[PDB]
């Protein structure tokens, strides 16, 4: 329902040839000393983590052009298109520019997630393909503007401009 | 199946024996036709695939009344 909303210029979408596992986790911490008593404020929330493993192959089964990996991939010769190289070029640019990525998953939808690490390898087994791992964490983020929305600001001391 | 029939010496007229001619050998064949034109009858459902009766009995092939 929402995959069809993605165009080819603004809302770019990425689909992997296969995803093996994905895990989601959150953490909390509490004081290790007995509280004075209700003092239920002795707890804090950490950032949720998300990781998954995937693969990109020289012999794809589905080449839906809506995928940004398949922007200009040949229909009849997928292996000459060098799809695995296309994915890596995309992956580094997204991570390097620090984009706030949005994840669409089985159960829920996650937003404002940044990539902190990924790995690529080409082992002897599973030749003609690459295994990919990714890790993401939440981001608690908090001019031409309407004067009605403007607020008093500051710039400190200034010198000759 | 193809069939072949060959006359026996008792059926050859005496004249053909002088002329040394054998005839009336008969063969039979059936020819296999190719395909030229095909017609399709598609149907597109909108609400629900047509339901069927729950009659799980084997469909009878003929009517009992025959007079």
């Amino acid at each position: 329902n929402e995959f069809e909303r993605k165009n080819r210029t603004d809302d770019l979408a990425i689909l992997f040839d296969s995803v093996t596992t994905h895990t989601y986790t959150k953490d909390y911490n509490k004081s290790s000393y007995a509280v004075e008593s209700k003092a239920s404020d002795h707890v804090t929330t950490q950032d949720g983590k998300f990781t998954f493993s995937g693969t990109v192959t020289d012999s794809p089964y589905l080449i839906d052009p809506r995928n940004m990996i398949d922007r200009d991939t040949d229909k009849e010769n997928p292996m000459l298109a060098r799809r695995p190289a296309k994915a890596i070029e995309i992956l580094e640019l997204i991570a390097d520019s620090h984009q706030l990525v949005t994840l669409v998953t089985e159960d829920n939808i996650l937003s404002n997630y940044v990539i902190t690490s990924f790995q690529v390898d080409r082992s002897s087994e599973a030749g003609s393909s690459i295994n990919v791992q990714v890790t993401l964490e939440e981001f608690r983020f908090k001019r031409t503007s309407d004067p009605k929305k403007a607020k008093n600001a500051n710039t400190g001391t200034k010198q000759t401009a | 199946d193809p069939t072949i029939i060959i006359p026996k010496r008792a059926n050859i007229p005496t004249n053909d024996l002088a002329a040394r001619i054998l005839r009336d050998v008969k063969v039979e064949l059936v020819y296999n036709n190719s395909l030229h034109y095909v017609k399709i009858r598609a149907s597109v459902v909108l609400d629900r695939p047509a339901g069927q009766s729950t009659n799980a009995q084997t469909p009878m092939s003929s009517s009992a009344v025959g007079v």
Binding site: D17, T20, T57, D58, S59, Y61, E106, G127 | -
Partner: protein
Amino acid sequence: NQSKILTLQAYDPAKVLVFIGGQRVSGFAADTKIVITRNNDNISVHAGVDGEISNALSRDNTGVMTLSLQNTAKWNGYLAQWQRQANVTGLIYLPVQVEGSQGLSLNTIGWIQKQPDLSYGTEVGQMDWEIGVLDAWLSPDQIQGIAAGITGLLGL
């Protein structure tokens, strides 16, 4: 349909020619001359988390070729001498060709993998040489009417 003869001329074991280095090999034994096999499958499959199937072609094509010979054949001595020479100097690669009859054939470069085990008994024994080959893709070659058939297959 009725019965049909697959070919016109019968398969003949003596018509199968085996060449190692450039000389025909004689001295086969028992009821199995050669066995050609691969080491890994051509494609490995992986399941996904939402039903997708991803396939990856293999890039390794080595294989094995078991040669069965009597222990009264001179090619045993030839192979032993070659093994000793290869160990001493370093050259181990020699051409291997098998011309099958009414069947697939092979043409690649091979080497000696493992020396068999002798067994002196009441009867005449059998020695099986494992010859490893670089490429193990069988070629239709002699079989005719293959180029036309290949273009006939549909797929998407």
